[PDB]
């Protein structure tokens, strides 16, 4: 239910606050943007997607509420989007890795950081006050 917990102190995050099927977006190129929802799918989306292209609709990712810890980092991993453009035989993927931020930003949204083109994976980062122990 979009919590994990630090093993090694027992801290429990919850970013369940950050769900629902409304959700978010994220800026992409110039105009456009990524329509996205945490540990669920997002009503922009097609049914069953996390993220998508606003432009399109195109998938890029299934959700799943399998949140994970890794070196302070909270992730949910997106896969099995649309085909990738530049890689036959991928599928785009959507990575979201939230970190601690202990005052919330004065936009407080997800960002696209970075795509890989070589695996169409997408880089989001939400540095948030729910990421931090």
Same mark, same amino acid.
């Given at each position: !239910?979009?919590?994990?917990?630090?093993?090694?102190?027992?801290?429990?995050? !919850?970013?369940?606050? /950050?769900? #629902?099927?409304? #959700?978010?977006?994220?800026? +992409?190129? &110039?105009?456009? /943007?990524?329509?996205?929802?945490?540990?669920?799918?997002?009503?922009?989306?097609?049914?069953?997607?996390?993220?998508?292209?606003?432009?399109? $609709?195109?998938?890029?990712?299934?959700?799943?509420?399998?949140? $994970? +810890?890794? !070196?302070?980092?909270?992730?949910?991993? +997106?896969?099995? #989007?649309?085909?990738?453009?530049?890689?036959?035989?991928?599928? +785009?993927?959507?990575?979201?890795?939230?970190?601690?931020?202990? &005052?919330?930003? %004065?936009?407080?949204?997800?960002? /696209?950081?970075?795509? !890989?083109?070589?695996?169409?994976?997408?880089?989001?980062?939400?540095?948030? %006050?729910?990421?931090?122990?």
């Amino acid at each position: !239910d979009c919590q994990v917990t630090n093993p090694s102190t027992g801290h429990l995050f !919850d970013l369940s606050s /950050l769900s #629902g099927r409304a #959700g978010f977006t994220a800026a +992409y190129s &110039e105009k456009g /943007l990524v329509y996205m929802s945490i540990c669920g799918e997002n009503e922009n989306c097609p049914p069953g997607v996390g993220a998508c292209f606003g432009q399109t $609709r195109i998938s890029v990712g299934k959700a799943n509420k399998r949140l $994970r +810890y890794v !070196d302070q980092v909270l992730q949910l991993v +997106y896969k099995d #989007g649309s085909p990738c453009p530049s890689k036959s035989g991928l599928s +785009y993927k959507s990575v979201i890795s939230f970190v601690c931020r202990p &005052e919330a930003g %004065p936009t407080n949204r997800p960002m /696209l950081i970075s795509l !890989d083109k070589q695996t169409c994976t997408l880089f989001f980062s939400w540095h948030t %006050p729910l990421a931090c122990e």
